[PDB]
């Protein structure tokens, strides 16, 4: 029983407007450099579709995530240590640049320097950012399928359509689309870590953020295949891989991530989760994938249980981290209300970025309809987005927890209408899904009103603990290049000393 904390994220898909603001803000800050210009740590995808990279969800082709052997043990679908080591001179599964899109730019300067007397109006044509050559035609982008852009037969190739008769959805009246914004999951049992030969990828103990150490990474490029969400991007220029860093620089001080603070749809929730690190393998190795979701929930710990508080303390969790853990919106949605679900729990990584499924217009039916158990509002059975589709995406094929979520979302709508239109207290809907008046009220508070202070509850990473903040405060930033950062042994070949350090030791003890 080793309790550890992490700030997880819950995205409410019901409110996502598919604007991409999140993707841009991240790109401006973290990935505008040459080498990672095609990488989108946060990218939104329209579904049905094959996503970015193309068909990333197809683990039979890309070999991501884990598999559970017959002996019950866990093994990267890429292969065991030797199998993986043997694919090093050429990762046979590695996704190629074209799988993303060839990053392009346009020749704007032609608009300015076009010489006098041009036969035709000057123009700015596309150009490869990889070769610098003229591109005859832009044939792909990172958000190319945006808003059902592309023939249905192409889009329906979407892996989540497996086991569903998709013929009916190609019909106009049955059209449906939703948005899937995604970043790195910052898993509890991450596959990338297990698939990096040099040991350069690690999970931070204090906040559970997973990072690729830019000093130690050797560019063995195996991790890319190991990540089933394909959220690690090879930086073609530096030779090392980079990934979403969960904005740790801000998180460390108790701020939201850029893609969270800038979400226009006010759909992202940041809250602490306390997990037993000792149960990771046991939960992730459960025999039936339809049990991974539940088994993960069991790995989370009740921040209000004193038994957990004391173990947390005992285990080094800062008081404030424990405090915020008890006011965590992420906990309320994944644990109490059961509205948040994991993304592809079947990859056995124990993902930490969850989603609330979206509602949708009721399906097309013969007559204009009849009042359901929810009156003029929809019944979960009438929603047009096929529940099995959602289940393939969030619950390993199990429609039960998906319906529960949707049904409760709708229940709240029914209880609130009775209250604000009829002025009556009606809990028929609530009683049917097993919710209390209080819980629906709290659901409304967080989901509907979503005050900034309720959407984001991020504690400090306490960088003062186990280190020496004082000399850092005083000398951090002066990047004159003292050649001594990054190593514990003081001795160095250039005969120098750390600028943010004290080398004249006290003699008064």
């Amino acid at each position: 029983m080793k309790i550890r904390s992490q700030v997880g994220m819950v995205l409410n898909l019901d409110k996502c407007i598919g604007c991409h603001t999140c993707s841009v803000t991240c790109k401006n800050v973290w990935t505008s450099r040459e080498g990672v210009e095609y990488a989108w740590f946060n990218n939104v995808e329209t579904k049905p579709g094959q996503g970015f990279p193309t068909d990333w969800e197809n683990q039979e082709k890309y070999k991501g995530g884990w598999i559970r052997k017959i002996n019950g043990k866990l093994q990267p679908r890429m292969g065991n240590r030797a199998m993986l080591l043997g694919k090093i001179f050429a990762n046979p599964h590695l996704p190629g640049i074209d799988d993303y899109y060839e990053p392009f730019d346009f020749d704007y300067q032609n608009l300015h320097t076009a010489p006098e007397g041009s036969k035709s109006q000057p123009i700015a044509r596309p150009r490869s950012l990889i070769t610098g050559e003229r591109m005859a035609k832009i044939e792909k982008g990172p958000n190319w399928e945006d808003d059902l852009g592309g023939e249905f037969d192409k889009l329906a190739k979407d892996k989540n359509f497996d086991n569903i008769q998709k013929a009916m959805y190609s019909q106009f009246e049955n059209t449906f689309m939703m948005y899937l914004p995604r970043l790195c999951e910052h898993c509890l049992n991450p596959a990338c870590v297990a698939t990096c030969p040099s040991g350069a990828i690690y999970k931070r103990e204090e906040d559970g953020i997973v990072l690729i150490d830019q000093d130690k990474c050797r560019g063995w490029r195996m991790c890319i295949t190991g990540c089933p969400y394909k959220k690690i991007y090879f930086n073609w220029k530096s030779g090392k891989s980079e990934k979403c860093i969960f904005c740790y620089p801000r998180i460390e001080a108790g701020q939201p991530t850029v893609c969270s603070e800038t979400c226009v749809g006010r759909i992202r929730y940041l809250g602490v989760l306390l997990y037993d690190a000792d149960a990771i393998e046991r939960a992730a190795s459960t025999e039936n994938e339809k049990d991974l979701y539940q088994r993960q929930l069991d790995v989370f710990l009740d921040p209000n249980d004193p038994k957990v508080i004391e173990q947390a303390i005992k285990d080094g969790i800062p008081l404030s981290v424990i405090e915020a853990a008890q006011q965590s919106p992420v906990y309320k949605m994944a644990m109490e209300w059961k509205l948040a679900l994991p993304l592809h729990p079947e990859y056995r990584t124990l993902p930490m970025v969850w989603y609330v499924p979206p509602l949708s217009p009721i399906q097309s039916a013969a007559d204009a309809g009849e009042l359901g158990s929810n009156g003029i509002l929809p019944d979960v059975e009438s929603l047009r987005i096929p529940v099995q589709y959602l289940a393939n995406l969030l619950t390993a094929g199990d429609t039960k927890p998906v319906l529960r979520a949707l049904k409760r979302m709708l229940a709240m709508r029914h209880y609130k209408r009775a209250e604000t239109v009829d002025g009556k207290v009606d809990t028929r809907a609530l009683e049917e899904v097993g919710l209390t008046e209080a819980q629906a009220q709290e659901m409304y508070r967080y989901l509907a009103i979503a005050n900034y202070e309720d959407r984001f509850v991020v504690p400090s990473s306490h960088r003062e603990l186990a280190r020496e903040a004082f000399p850092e405060k005083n000398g951090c930033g002066f990047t004159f290049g003292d050649g001594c950062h990054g190593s514990d042994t003081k001795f160095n070949l250039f005969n120098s000393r750390r600028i943010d350090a004290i080398d004249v030791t006290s003699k008064t003890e």
Binding site: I362, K416, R417
Partner: protein
């Protein structure tokens, strides 16, 4: 040593040896921390963004989340923002950034060679422009490269030289500037406008031009636009998003819509395609595009039936009684066996004139519940000429006593007359369904006979009865045209609309029923968000009136959480504090405002290709031979009748008119009228090609006019610029059609009219590309300015995060310098001149009560030319040309002398000025000595803030006081508890400030109620600036009744006949096909801005693209991303296809503004560079939008006038074959099959 570290650290394992805690170095993490850290943050932007500077450069931006929080029971605004907004930072040092003033080489060569022969710049300009081979040698260079680096010193001089030369020979109104949406940057827009206003140049409009202006609004409420704020959406329990792609186009506010769904609110999306908006609703109805009025009619029908007749609603009934013109009495005209509804009955028509001696002919009449006839309060007549009677208290305007108007005559009529109503549901093209009934539908209306004050007898009935009649409600009089059941196919039944729209009748019924039930239950909390989906069709008025009637029948307007929510391109709230700065009304009155659609229709000569004839738009009950001519003829008439503005106004330099009058021994005013009658002086409009009645100098800033908003791009390029174009059809001349009967014709139209086109921008846009001079302006991150919005009540700033880079300058500094140079270069050419300025009859002014009973053309001798009544005013404006720069940079005296005001009221603002003198300091000496200064943008902003009621609680109270006179009701309480409030530019810099409630608007800034349009009308009984003073369902103006729009009626999309003459004419070998060409606002830009931004381009498809349904795409052999060509009579465009299922067969969408500078290959139809979306559209004005001098239908800059509708358009689509870039690169392609 990192090498020595290896030889050293493994802590405990966990998860049964599945894991290992390592105690190892993590200093490498500083790397990403060092990227995040920045030099500081600055607030700028309708969303406050934090600008992050780092290494002394702007590196990125994020949303400010410190807006003042809203009531606890409402979600807050933070963070707002959008994807376009988040990418702005890119522009600053991008490869498309304009760094220096640029000039066309050919023009620079002739300019320097001229200056060497003419020491005086004006003469040097005169030498080039007056030479036909010189003029044309650089006009043809337009859009064909050649830009060279120039200097501020050079361009400023050339510009002023050209401006002086043009004002001096042709006149000030031959100089113009186009700038849009001022709310985006009040001062940036005001800069060019102030300079143009001072020198007498014309200031073109934009709201009507973009077709963002909903004519139905001025029609029904006599207000251009006022709507509830997005926060208010949260107080609605039933919402319909009709033709409004909210999440994509109203991104920062969408959350109020997705969040209110959790409060129990039901939502419905009405779109022909599965739009992003559908994704967030409870129901999706997909009518055939352009057939919405129908559906709205059937819903209104069901409502009237079930909520007004079968089971009457206490709330809806009282509401329509006290707030609409339904009880008002309409006169019936006589016909061949039936009657037609005529003008409304005016108190005048009655013998005693109902006691009303002041404007009796402008007062409406109804019947109280005692059968007595009365002229109730609020009618427009009581607005001017008298006091305390322009309110909405249900009182007898004669005895000042509480009465009660009755709605239906039925049950007390003298007889049952039969009235004819026009029906167009049977006309239309082949692409839309039609229901055949009768061009005229006869209904049995309960009437009554009255004895007119002139002996004659006449029949009357109410707007109310006339309405139920027009909707098809059987009321007992056994009418063969009314409905027996919703299933009965009649004049606007659910079954009827199911055939037109394709939406099951059961749906029309269910929703109509829920919508109304909710409004009854909550007392008006049903709202309808509507956008360009409906407002960009030729018959936008019908779509909006359809939506409006449903809302009025359910008493939703004026109720928090209910109403008509129109959102498009924003809202400059502190108006009256900005109008004087932007149009220099503090120095001279008035300025030259112009409605741009008529302007371009005329000068880009798009009228010479007209295919639409007014005839085919007349009511079947109208004197066809009493409405003849080209649509442009109606405009010329409207202009000389004082209805619409003119530009250029007169066919003779207006600066020389004063001098000629003095030699005539009469004043300029009377001398002009004499001449106008005698034919001495003519309206320039009558002869737009004579050679002196066309604009010569055009300024464009904060716009991409020639590459975006410019409808009829090829016509614009041919006649306004004089370059090659892709127009495909022949003109009226070449075809043989009939010439207008008010305009000179000429087989070979005048080309290249614009002598000098100056564009201000920070990016080399499509407009810049076809310019003569590009002025490098500053981005929104390098200048100070202000912003307001329709979506919320916050006023925030734009701040320079850093100084404009390279040689950029703020729009303010740019016009300041041009003004300074104009002031010296004009010495010896223009001094203190006198200018004759025509001015159309203004709305919200006593003159709006011009022609009360009919229409009289003074040029037809039907009446006397009376400026201000049957013609525009003829004003005298003195201009101190050498004093321009000084006037530009100082606050005029007129504010102190004449005061300040708007929307009909006026107050004293002397105290404000004294305050300004203190914050802006004053002139040491010179022509404007002692006056407050206007040197910097801050000064100007403080002028707007200190002068506006919305931002100054002291001017706010003075305002309500002024209005209080008119109503007789105290309104000052609306501002009293905020009177000490004063918004300072530096204050909004630290935190966005909510504004003060003002009479300029009808919603309120309050802590218990949201800002909801019409709330002051319904709750403070303030009248709607309309004929009856109430919400006008009945349009009784001649032109409206004769064009079939007295009451709303379904109108099929029009035929632009732009396809059959060109289809197949230039086959490339691939199948061709006609498709409805819709251009809704896009997702990777705002209009044209961002359409060159790499972030947006990478998130979209990489350049211009058009969406086609799967069937249409396969029928044409088009695969996703294939190069295709869309073209018709007007021109052609090249792009790539986006094949998708969510696009209904039959239509095509090329999302609005993807412009002409990125990824466009040569067209196979014009052998030129492919065109843009507007290369296939063309202006086609509608008469009903030209009406003036009639209460709510009187003019107003951006308030009324012809609109740029274009959804009705059809194009030919086909896959491309040869893809040649025309750049000599040798990198061309060929698509097979």
């Amino acid at each position: 040593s990192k090498f020595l570290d290896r030889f050293r650290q493994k802590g405990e394992t966990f998860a049964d040896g599945h894991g290992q805690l390592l105690n190892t170095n993590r200093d490498w993490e500083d790397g990403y921390r060092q990227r995040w850290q920045h030099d500081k943050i600055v607030r700028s932007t309708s969303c406050s963004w934090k600008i992050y500077v780092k290494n002394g450069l702007v590196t990125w931006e994020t949303q400010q989340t410190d807006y003042p929080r809203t009531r606890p029971d409402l979600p807050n605004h933070e963070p707002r923002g959008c994807p376009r907004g988040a990418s702005y930072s890119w522009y600053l040092y991008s490869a498309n950034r304009l760094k220096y003033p640029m000039m066309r080489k050919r023009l620079m060569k002739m300019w320097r060679e001229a200056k060497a022969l003419h020491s005086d710049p004006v003469e040097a300009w005169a030498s080039i422009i007056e030479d036909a081979d010189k003029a044309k040698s650089f006009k043809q260079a337009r859009g064909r490269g050649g830009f060279v680096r120039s200097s501020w010193q050079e361009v400023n001089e050339l510009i002023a030289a050209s401006n002086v030369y043009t004002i001096k020979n042709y006149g000030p109104d031959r100089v113009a500037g186009f700038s849009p949406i001022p709310a985006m940057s009040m001062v940036s827009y005001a800069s060019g406008a102030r300079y143009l206003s001072l020198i007498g140049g014309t200031c073109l409009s934009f709201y009507d031009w973009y077709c963002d202006l909903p004519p139905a609004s001025p029609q029904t409420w006599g207000e251009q636009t006022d709507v509830p704020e997005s926060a208010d959406w949260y107080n609605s329990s039933y919402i319909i998003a009709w033709g409004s792609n909210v999440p994509q186009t109203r991104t920062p506010d969408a959350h109020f819509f997705t969040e209110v769904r959790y409060k129990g609110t039901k939502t419905v999306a009405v779109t022909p395609d599965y739009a992003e908006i559908a994704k967030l609703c409870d129901l999706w109805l997909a009518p055939k595009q352009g057939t919405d009025a129908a559906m709205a009619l059937a819903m209104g029908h069901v409502m009237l039936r079930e909520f007004h007749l079968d089971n009457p609603s206490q709330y809806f009934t009282d509401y329509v009684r006290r707030y609409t013109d339904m009880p008002m009495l309409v006169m019936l005209e006589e016909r061949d066996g039936y009657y037609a509804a005529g003008r409304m009955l005016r108190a005048a028509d009655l013998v005693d004139a109902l006691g009303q001696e002041n404007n009796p002919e402008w007062k409406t009449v109804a019947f109280n519940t005692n059968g007595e006839m009365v002229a109730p309060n609020g009618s427009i007549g009581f607005r001017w000429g008298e006091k305390g009677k322009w309110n909405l208290e249900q009182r007898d305007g004669k005895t000042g006593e509480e009465t009660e108007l009755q709605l239906s005559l039925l049950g007390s009529q003298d007889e049952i007359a039969e009235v004819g109503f026009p029906y167009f549901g049977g006309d239309g093209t082949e692409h839309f369904n039609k229901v055949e009934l009768e061009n005229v539908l006869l209904h049995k209306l309960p009437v009554k006979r009255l004895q007119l004050a002139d002996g004659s007898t006449a029949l009357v009935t109410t707007v109310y009865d006339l309405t139920l009649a027009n909707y098809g409600l059987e009321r007992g009089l056994n009418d063969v045209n009314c409905a027996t059941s919703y299933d009965d196919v009649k004049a606007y039944t659910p079954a009827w609309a199911e055939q037109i729209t394709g939406v099951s009748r059961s749906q029309i019924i269910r929703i109509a029923r829920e919508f109304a039930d909710n409004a009854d239950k909550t007392h008006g909390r049903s709202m309808i968000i509507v956008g360009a989906g409906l407002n960009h069709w030729y018959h936008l008025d019908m779509n909006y009136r359809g939506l409006i009637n449903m809302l009025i029948f359910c008493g939703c307007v004026g109720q928090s959480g209910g109403g008509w929510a129109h959102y498009v391109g924003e809202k400059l709230r502190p108006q009256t504090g900005w109008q004087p700065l932007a149009f220099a009304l503090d120095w001279q009155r008035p300025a030259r405002h112009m409605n741009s659609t008529s302007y371009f229709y005329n000068h880009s000569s798009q009228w010479r290709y007209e295919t639409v004839t007014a005839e085919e738009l007349l009511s079947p009950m109208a004197d066809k031979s009493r409405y003849t001519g080209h649509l442009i003829d109606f405009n010329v008439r409207a202009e000389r009748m004082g209805w619409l503005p003119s530009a250029p106004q007169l066919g003779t330099n207006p600066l020389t008119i004063a001098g000629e009058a003095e030699k005539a021994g009469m004043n300029p005013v009377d001398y002009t009228v004499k001449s106008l009658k005698e034919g001495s002086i003519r309206f320039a409009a009558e002869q737009p090609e004579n050679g002196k009645n066309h604009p010569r100098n055009l300024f464009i800033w904060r716009s991409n006019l020639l590459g975006s908003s410019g409808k009829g791009h090829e016509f614009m390029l041919k006649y306004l610029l004089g370059t090659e174009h892709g127009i495909q059809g022949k003109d009226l001349g070449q075809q043989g059609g009939v010439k207008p009967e008010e305009v000179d014709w000429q087989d070979n139209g005048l080309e290249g009219k614009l002598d000098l086109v100056v564009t201000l921008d920070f990016r080399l846009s499509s407009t810049c590309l076809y310019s003569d001079i590009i002025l490098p302006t500053a981005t929104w991150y390098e200048k100070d300015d202000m912003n307001t919005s329709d979506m919320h009540p916050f006023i925030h700033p734009l701040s320079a995060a850093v100084d404009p880079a390279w040689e950029a300058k703020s729009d303010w500094e740019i016009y300041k310098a041009i003004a300074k140079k104009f002031s010296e270069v004009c010495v010896g050419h223009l001094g203190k001149e006198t200018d004759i300025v025509t001015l159309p009859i203004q709305h919200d002014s006593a003159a709006e009560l011009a022609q009360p009973l009919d229409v009289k053309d003074w040029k037809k001798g039907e009446c006397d030319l009376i400026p201000g009544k049957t013609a525009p005013h003829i004003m005298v404006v003195e201009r101190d040309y050498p004093a321009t720069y000084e006037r530009f940079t100082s606050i005029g005296p007129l504010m102190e002398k004449i005061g300040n005001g708007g929307k009909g009221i006026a107050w004293n603002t002397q105290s404000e000025m004294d305050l300004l003198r203190k914050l802006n300091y004053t002139k040491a000496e010179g022509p404007a000595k002692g006056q407050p200064m206007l040197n910097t943008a801050i000064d100007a902003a403080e002028m707007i803030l200190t002068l506006a009621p919305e931002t100054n609680g002291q001017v706010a109270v003075k305002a309500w006081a002024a209005l209080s006179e008119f109503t007789g009701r105290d309104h000052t309480h609306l501002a009293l508890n905020k009177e000490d409030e004063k918004i300072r530019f530096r204050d909004i810099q630290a935190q966005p400030r909510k504004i003060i409630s003002s009479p300029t608007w009808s919603g309120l800034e309050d802590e218990h109620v949201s800002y909801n349009a019409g709330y002051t009308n319904v709750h403070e009984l303030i009248p709607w600036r309309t004929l009856s003073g109430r919400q006008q369902l009945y349009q009784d103006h001649q032109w409206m009744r004769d064009f079939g729009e007295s009451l709303l009626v379904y109108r099929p999309p029009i035929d632009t006949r732009s396809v059959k003459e060109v289809i197949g004419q230039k086959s490339n070998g691939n199948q061709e096909k006609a498709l409805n060409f819709l251009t809704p606002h896009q997702k990777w830009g705002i209009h044209s801005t961002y359409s060159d931004n790499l972030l947006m381009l990478t998130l979209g498809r990489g350049g211009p693209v058009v969406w086609l349904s799967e069937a249409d795409a396969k029928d044409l052999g088009i695969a996703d991303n294939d190069w295709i060509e869309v073209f018709n009579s007007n021109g052609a465009l090249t792009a790539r296809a986006v094949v998708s299922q969510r696009v209904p067969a039959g239509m095509t969408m090329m999302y609005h503004a993807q412009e002409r500078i990125v990824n466009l290959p040569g067209s196979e139809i014009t052998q030129q560079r492919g065109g843009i979306h507007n290369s296939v559209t063309r202006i086609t004005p509608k008469p009903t939008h030209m009406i003036g001098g009639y209460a709510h239908l009187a003019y107003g800059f951006n308030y009324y006038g012809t609109v740029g509708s274009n959804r009705d358009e059809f194009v030919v689509v086909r896959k491309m074959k040869n893809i040649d870039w025309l750049d000599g690169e040798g990198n061309d392609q060929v698509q097979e099959s």
